[PDB]
RNA sequence: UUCAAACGAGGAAAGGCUUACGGUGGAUACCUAGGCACCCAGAGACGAGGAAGGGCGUAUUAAUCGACGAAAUGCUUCGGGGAGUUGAAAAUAAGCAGAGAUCCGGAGAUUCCCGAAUAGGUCAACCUUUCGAACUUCUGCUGAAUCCAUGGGCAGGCAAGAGACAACCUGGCGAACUGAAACAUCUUAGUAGCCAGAGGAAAAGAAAGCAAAAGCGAUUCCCGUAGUAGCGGCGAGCGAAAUGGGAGCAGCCUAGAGCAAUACAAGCGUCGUGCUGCUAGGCGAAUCAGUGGAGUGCGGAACCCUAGAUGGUGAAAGUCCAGUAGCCGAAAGCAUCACUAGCUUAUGCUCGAGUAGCAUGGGGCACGUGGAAUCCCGUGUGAAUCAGCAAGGACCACCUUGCAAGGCUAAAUACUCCUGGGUGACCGAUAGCGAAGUAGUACCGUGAGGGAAGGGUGAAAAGAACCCCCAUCGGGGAGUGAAAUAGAACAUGAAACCGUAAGCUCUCAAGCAGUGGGAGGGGGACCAGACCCUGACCGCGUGCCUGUUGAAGAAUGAGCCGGCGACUCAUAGGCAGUGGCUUGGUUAAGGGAACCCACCGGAGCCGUAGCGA
RNA sequence: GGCCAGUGAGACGAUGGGGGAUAAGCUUCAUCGUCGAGAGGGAAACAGCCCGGAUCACCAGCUAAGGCCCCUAAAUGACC
RNA sequence: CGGUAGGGGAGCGUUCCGUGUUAGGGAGAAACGCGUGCGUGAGCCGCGUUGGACGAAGCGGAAGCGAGAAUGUCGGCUUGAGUAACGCAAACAUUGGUGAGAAUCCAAUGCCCCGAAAACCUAAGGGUUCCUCCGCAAGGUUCGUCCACGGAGGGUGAGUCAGGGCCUAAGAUCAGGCCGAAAGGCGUAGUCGAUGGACAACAGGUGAAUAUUCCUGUACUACCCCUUGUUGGUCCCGAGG
RNA sequence: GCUCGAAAGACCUUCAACAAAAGGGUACCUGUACCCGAAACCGACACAGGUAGGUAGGUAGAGAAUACCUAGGGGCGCGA
RNA sequence: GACCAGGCCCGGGCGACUGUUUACCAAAAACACAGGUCUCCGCAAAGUCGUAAGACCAUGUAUGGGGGCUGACGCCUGCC
RNA sequence: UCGGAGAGAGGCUCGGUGAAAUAGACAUGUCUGUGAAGAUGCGGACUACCUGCACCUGGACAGAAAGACCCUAUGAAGCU
RNA sequence: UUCGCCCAUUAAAGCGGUACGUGAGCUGGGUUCAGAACGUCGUGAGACAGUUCGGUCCAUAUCCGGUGUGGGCGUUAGAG
């Protein structure tokens, strides 16, 4: 059955898959199949890294402080630290706000003396 | 009339496969594959004649709105029976010069002045259809917003579309 | 400035990524005097007075084709018509021509060899006598075996025997695969296929029919009646008829004398006349100036038009050209209708005549014998014969109807090689017929037979003098053109693939390697405001699809790319959505002054009352 | 009740019983759940075991199972 | 609001057509990039470059409606690759000529192989591949001024050779006729078909290519006609051979 | 083909037959180039495969064996 | 003395032998062969080819021919 | 049995011409364990500069072959 | 035939895994390819984990993994 002639139609269905493939190391950007198995990866992993992006930092923040705990005095855990604020009443200074360690370590030094007084 | 290849494998030749066993090539023959060129065709349009059977009372009342929605607006009106006399066309260009729309706004010129015969002078013009005052379908009538009639044609439209 | 320790960019044979510039190659978009279908109107035939199909030749050199044929791409005659003529792929050379030099059409002459061919033979287009095939019908002349008579033979006048025939049609003979979810019944096909004959229509056809005691009443074709009834391992499956509505629609011959073949009609011809068609042909309207390489484009204005169908001309006009509406023409040669004529048959009225079954074994009717006939037969026999016989799906009686044993018969109905016009929401050279450019060729096989690839530079080619390098292959310039970043691989020319240049990453780092976080570097930013492109390193992390309870794999399919490639169509039935009408609704065939498939047609089907064998 | 389906060789774990030596992710039944037609977190890596069963974004918190020396976030925390 | 097979509910795009010689286009489709804005998505819109012609907005209608796999089909293009191979082991080289270049061309001096053979002649087949003058991209699995490559000319002249022509075997066909559903088979007179049989010369020379055919010297057979002598001849034959 | 005989049927001073000049005329039509156990044949190619007949020398030897030499034909077409 | 130019003997299974054959892996104690025997036909044969005709078989003819098994020869070939 | 040496045709290098089976994609190390349970690409760990040539040649259930073995499908083709 | 038995030694003259190591190495002798024959089974075609004779199993390999040998670069001022 003489189709309606794919012509340019089936031409756009492949090049569009190539435009997306313009930053890959391997030859997964110069073939519909090599990219077919490539896009799916960036089609599944993408659906993951999007939710993993939050977890990826969940360990970071804790690690950021962890490296800052092995110097002060509370060699115990940063948990007791969080416990102090919890039992206290500070809904601030979150895992993200833990950036006070690196820059201006003078502010993060105050809470260090406020956690001991509470507990 | 999109006649295609009905009996695919049944073309100018026939199916004559090769020794299909321990070779490597696809297990199949040549010609009329039809996947392979120079062969027949599996599916394809056949001599069709799509002609739905319509009733009668469903058409009469379906063509009444045609002239109804026309006379409602400000389109061309009727004329007279003396329009069948004029055997020439120039007498028409001068006539349509009075009613208006000379450069022909578009294909809006559904003419239906005559009754017995056709206006061989009104068919020459680019945009204009000479339909006989009898089976005025919804197609042509709305095909051209502008439509002109007469004192006679309007009568015949009362015989069918009416009692 | 000297010794050690802790670190360290810079460096690449090559490579990866992004980007720029090309090659290979080829698709797509676009356009095609050609195919694929169909409608209307014609043509359905040629041919031993020698064909289809070919070989060998022919023009001024001239291989291949289109014709023709050694009066060989030309001749004779008439006509139309109008000028150029020597066909085409390539000019040129040498000319014929301005009231018959070509071309177009009809009527004739010519038409080697081979092929029915018909001289014999034959690896066809060759050979050898020679003007001769062999048969059917008729006539004459001869004439065996035994007196006649024949047989046989000879001669002459016709026809027949050929197309190795495209479909339709009649007749003879005659499967399987497959269906019956197994398969020998059955069905599937009495199709395909083989063979014979004729017409262009054939076949069939005015009825010992059907129905029925109402009446119709030739055959064939179409739509219904029922795809019911019936038939069948009543399984598969196949499939009536009566009747009704339409297209079409006329009925006649053969089957002892006298006066006697005059009248009335039907079927034809040697030829010719007329109407209407076919094969050449003629008449056939209308504007400019401005932008652009060019305009038939746009803007202003005007004109023709029963002809703005269409196409072409260097890009969309109806007004440039060829045509188109309409109006005319054809010394002749012909088809189909009428009117008149050689010859044979055929013809009126009256009074008659009027052509013999079944049992068994088969086929065909929807019917595979079953209660189930009838029709056509192989074989053995074989009555009556119109105050007689047959048919009414066993038979019988009654009644009714019809009476064949010999034949002919237009139209409605079928199909198509081919012809002319036109149409088609058919395709467009990996499409469509295998063939839209000298392919069913070139090639493969002994052969039957099988069976491609390959499209367009531009409007006109002005398709590239000369100059420079080389072996006087090839290229670059100079020029032509609006373009050759169009030039003979040439249009628009992507992808797979193959390279150069530039930025970044890249030797102590490994696992379908991307992704998230993410430094540095080469650039681009904003009169900071921390962003847009590459990416060290880091956390995770075993293609897709198919088939499976279950795989990433040692489960399988796939080298890449372009194109191409798999539930469409017809009829019918049952539902859902929706629409018109409504216990009513709705047609099929056909007719049709049909811009139009309306109107008419309601023959027929479905539903509201059912149930029961 | 009506229209269109799909699928009839499933596997595994816990539990209650036939087969085998109560040997097998073996085979044959019943029941529940999972896989099979739902990831992910955890058992190093193991679909069928456990938790929980994914409309989506988010450098947002708190939890389940499983854990908290380092390697991948988290107690070499206290008492016996 | 995970989702296979499946069921149900909504849309985009492609070719064409109706609504369209309305409108957009040579101040210009198609092919590629970009704006990475927009929609749930397949995509759409605008635009630069290149390029050369038309294409087509909206709704609906009719579709041969978009595949990276069916050991698919057609064509082109990678990789193993530039690894193997360059095809009996009868080695080769040199001095010169010509040419842009030649170990393999030509010419000369030799080596080496074969020697009933990789000599010549002839039949079948092939069929112009023979000769000469030039050219070479392609064909010669190296080049090539070489070639049985390509493009132009030239060349096969016998009554005695051979094939036709007489005759004939296996065998084929085959008037009339005998048979067979049609077709056709078989088969005789007769008529075809061979590797069979039947009349007739060679030796030299000549040409770039032919020669028992051209030329020279020397001969032969058969038929018809004519002259002379003698004698009786005579069919699809009998007999001998 | 040739020779001879043919109820001497037909012919019958004829036409013919044999021979002689081994006179004269005539003897029409085709192929015949090249190769041919060869690379132009048959096998897809210039694949050492296969393929009838004829002529066929010197020396050693029984021998168209074999080896070495004639005439003649080649070194087989990628090299170092 | 080069080229050229049988390896020999002994015992044993089977087939007498020569020959033929699975043309492109088996050629063998396979097959074939003569010998012997059984059986059918006096015939236009049986029988084979063919729907037929016709024809092969034999223009011979039962010391013929056709079909089957066996199958050189030597000793033999039982019972049912 | 322990084979060695030498002479030729290839192999190796260079110059000219110039293939293939096959292949989803590559930055295709080993080992233990695990895994529809004998994978380099999973997990842990060890080892390891990047890139050729020649050669030996186990892995990639390598390549060619939808196997001629078995079974299945009320398949087919012959034979008795 | 692995094995085993036998003759003759050694200090002793081991077992087992490695898809019963090893055919992308040879051998392929045995054994489910086609031939043939004996015995047996069936009327027969054939059949039988009985025996006997004969009976073509390829490949210049990229990578992984090895036997060896190089081309660059990095150890940093450049080299021996």
List the structure tokens of B66.
Answer: 């045609």
Cβ–Cβ under 8 Å, residues A66 and A59: no
φ, ψ at B129 (rounded to 5°): -120, 130
Total structural domains in chain B? 1
For the CA of A70 and the C1' of C486, the distance in angstroms is 79
Which residues of A fall within a CB distance of 8 Å from B43?
A: 1
List the structure tokens of B39.
Answer: 């062969």
Cβ–Cβ under 8 Å, residues B60 and B160: yes
Whether omega for the bond prior to residue B17 falls within 30 degrees of 0, making it cis, is no
Which residues of A fall within a CB distance of 8 Å from B41?
A: 1-2
Helix intervals (H) in A1-119: 9-19, 32-39, 41-69, 78-88, 110-118
Distance (Å) of CA B51 to CA B48, B54, B136: 9, 9, 18
B43–A2 C-beta distance less than 8 A: no
Tell the residue number behind the tokens 């120039």, with chain if given: B90
Burial of A86 (0-12, 13-18, 19+ CB in 10 A): middle
Instruction: List all residues 6 or more positions away from B41 whose beta carbon is below 8 Å from its beta carbon.
Output: A1, A2, B4, B5, B8, B34
Cβ–Cβ under 8 Å, residues A84 and A118: yes
Chain A residues 12-71 with a CB less than 8 Å from chain B = none
Cβ–Cβ under 8 Å, residues A83 and A93: no
Instruction: List all residues 6 or more positions away from B112 whose beta carbon is below 8 Å from its beta carbon.
Output: B130, B131, B132, B133, B136, B147, B148, B149, B150, B153
Instruction: List all residues 6 or more positions away from B38 whose beta carbon is below 8 Å from its beta carbon.
Output: B31
The C-alpha R_g of chain B, in whole angstroms, comes to 28
Nearest to A68 by CA among A77, A59, A58, A57: A77
3-state class (DSSP) for residue B154 = helix
Bridge partners, residue B147, by sequence: B110
Q: Is A2 on the interface with B (CB under 8 A)?
A: yes
List the structure tokens of B3.
Answer: 């006649």
Measure in Å the smallest separation between the Cα of A58 and chain B Cα atoms: 57
Cβ–Cβ under 8 Å, residues A18 and A29: yes
Residue A91 CA to residue A98 CA, distance in Å, equals: 13
Residue B65 CA to residue B78 CA, distance in Å, equals: 17
Bases of chain E with protein Cβ within 7 A:
13-15, 18-22, 30-34, 42-44, 62-68, 70-74
Helix intervals (H) in B2-160: 57-72, 90-93, 96-99, 138-143, 153-160
Residue B74 CA to residue B76 CA, distance in Å, equals: 7
Q: Is A1 on the interface with B (CB under 8 A)?
A: yes
Domain span including residue B51:
1-162
Cβ–Cβ under 8 Å, residues B150 and B83: yes
Residue B152 CA to residue B115 CA, distance in Å, equals: 8
Which residues of A fall within a CB distance of 8 Å from B2?
A: none
Tell the residue number behind the tokens 């004329």, with chain if given: B79
Bases of chain C with protein Cβ within 7 A:
16-19, 27-29, 36-38, 304-309, 325, 424-428, 430-434, 440, 450-453, 494, 496-497, 512-517, 533-535, 539-540, 543-544, 560-570, 579-581, 585-588, 594-601
Instruction: List all residues 6 or more positions away from B129 whose beta carbon is below 8 Å from its beta carbon.
Output: B109, B110, B111, B140, B143, B144
Q: Are strands B129-130 and B110-111 parallel, antiparallel or unpaired?
A: parallel
Residues written for chain B: 163
Tell the residue number behind the tokens 């260009």, with chain if given: B93
Measure in Å the smallest separation between the Cα of A5 and chain B Cα atoms: 14
A63 CB closer than 7 A to any strand D atom = yes
């Amino acid at each position: 059955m003489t189709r309606v002639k794919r012509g340019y139609i089936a031409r756009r269905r492949r090049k569009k898959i190539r435009f997306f493939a313009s930053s890959f190391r391997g030859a997964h950007s110069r073939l519909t199949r090599t990219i077919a198995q490539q896009k799916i990866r960036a089609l599944v992993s993408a659906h993951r890294d999007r939710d993993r992006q939050k977890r990826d930092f969940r360990r970071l923040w804790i690690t950021r402080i962890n490296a800052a705990i092995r110097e002060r005095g509370v060699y115990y855990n940063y948990s007791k630290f969080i416990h102090d604020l919890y039992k206290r009443q500070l809904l601030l200074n979150r895992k993200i706000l833990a950036q006070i360690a690196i820059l201006n370590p003078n502010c993060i030094y105050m809470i260090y003396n406020e956690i001991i007084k509470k507990e | 009339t999109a006649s295609t290849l009905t009996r695919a494998e049944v073309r100018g030749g026939g199916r004559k496969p090769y020794p299909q066993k321990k070779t490597g090539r696809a297990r199949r023959g040549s010609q009329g594959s039809p996947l392979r060129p120079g062969g027949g065709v599996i599916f394809g349009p056949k001599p069709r004649d799509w002609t739905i059977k319509m009733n009668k009372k469903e058409r009469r009342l379906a063509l009444s709105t045609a002239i109804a929605s026309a006379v409602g607006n400000s389109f061309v009106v009727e004329e007279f029976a003396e329009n069948f006399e004029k055997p020439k066309t120039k007498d028409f260009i001068a006539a349509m010069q009075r009613w208006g729309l000379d450069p022909a706004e578009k294909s809006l010129f559904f003419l239906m002045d005559l009754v017995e015969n056709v206006e061989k002078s009104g068919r020459n013009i680019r945009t204009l259809k000479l339909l006989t005052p009898r089976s005025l379908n919804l197609f042509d009538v709305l095909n051209a917003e502008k439509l002109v009639f007469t004192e006679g044609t309007i009568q015949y439209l009362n015989q069918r579309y009416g009692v």
